[PDB]
Design a protein around this ligand. Structure first.
Ligand SMILES: N#CCOc1ccc(OC[C@@H](O)Cn2cnc3ccc(Cl)cc3c2=O)cc1
Ligand SMILES: N#CCOc1ccc(OC[C@@H](O)Cn2cnc3ccc(Cl)cc3c2=O)cc1
Lengths: 203, 203
């Protein structure tokens, strides 16, 4: 039995070739979605017994878990197209620390340096749907993955603010936290190659 | 008078088209090299009066300085080709926290999450030359930028360890910290485009 955790920041298209790869080698494979904000908190629970976590969230060393980089993926800062700074420049990008942010909350009230909110006026949600609902309704601005925002950007229901900060969108590493056991395993090596190959194709 | 700080992690080839761009707009331009480990510590000193810092080091917010991403650049973990884990796998990559690391030190004894050493057995230096001297002499392993390591990798005087962690080498963002003053300036916007254009060409 192999258990795999995928934070909601990872495109669901990723989970395709990946899950196929694992089934050739492993006979039972369990896939768990979680908020990026809960990804690492979850695998630290001993009882949870996750073998592999695939999340954008970072920490320097977890107990009995090694880390490596599968690839890279783009998030964007998005708001209502009539938001106070809807198209304003690098000036209004400093100002985001003043305007209301819609951030992922976490079961453990704590947030990593990466995922911690930037502004004082913050309002927490559990998932990127709940996030972009409030952001579509001008309640605030938020950072969501490409795959969530591509749809609504076409339709002009949402506007990007990040481009002057990071053109192409905000590149962020996809990490793979694996039980130290899987380290000397041909099984895992084979999954790593495929998983990496995969994320390359999505940009 | 414009003052610009470039950490030693930035290729010196970058500083070419960049310095040219600034001179069209600005009439006096001063370029300062510094250790990545001293980059941010230096601009926080009020008396230093840096207008623009270009460094790989990250912090969520400095006083009276906005941040943005110029581009991306690759560092590699390097050691002696006969180092205990000279070609060993993802197992020996966990083990780096045990073997002696050669790390950049800092005037302020403190290090950011990014640049802080990973292992217990650490030995500090001021620059990447002093680093790769000790690493060529098998004293330990270290993380240096591509441009420092390309030379010695050809010659087989150094070996890579990072590939199983991050194939292609360890991607790291080049940040641009700028005095909030430069925000509403055509001068700076023009430099940003060129500087970004530049780093794209180096990979
Ligand atoms: N303008 C402009 C750009 O300046 C910014 C720099 C960092 C930011 O972080 C906000 C943080 O509270 C949440 N956060 C972070 N980094 C993420 C990366 C990927 C994904 Cl999928 C989500 C997040 C996220 O949800 C915000 C603005
Ligand atoms: N195997 C393997 C790979 O796993 C590692 C992950 C992070 C590491 O950081 C070491 C840190 O003490 C210094 N450090 C960091 N990140 C850098 C990025 C760019 C540049 Cl130019 C230098 C550094 C650096 O000098 C080491 C290994």
């Amino acid at each position: 039995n192999l258990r795999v955790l995928l934070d909601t920041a990872i495109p669901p298209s990723f989970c395709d070739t990946v899950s196929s790869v694992l089934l050739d080698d492993f006979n039972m494979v369990s896939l768990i979605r979680t908020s990026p904000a809960d990804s690492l908190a979850t695998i630290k629970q001993d009882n949870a017994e996750i073998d592999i976590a695939i999340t954008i969230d970072e920490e320097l060393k977890i107990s009995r878990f090694n880390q490596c980089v599968l690839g890279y993926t783009k998030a964007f800062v998005v708001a209502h197209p009539q938001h106070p700074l809807c198209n304003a420049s690098l000036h209004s990008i400093a100002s985001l620390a003043n305007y209301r942010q819609i951030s992922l909350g976490s079961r453990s009230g704590q947030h990593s340096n990466l995922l911690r909110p930037v502004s004082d006026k913050v309002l927490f949600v559990e998932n990127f749907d709940d996030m972009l609902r409030l952001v579509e309704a001008g309640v605030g601005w938020g950072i969501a993955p490409h795959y969530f925002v591509e749809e609504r950007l076409r339709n002009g229901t949402l506007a990007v603010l990040s481009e002057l900060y990071e053109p192409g969108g905000i590149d962020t590493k996809v990490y793979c936290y694996y039980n130290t056991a899987l380290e000397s395993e041909r099984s895992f090596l084979r999954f790593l190659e495929s998983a990496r190959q995969r994320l390359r194709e999505l940009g």
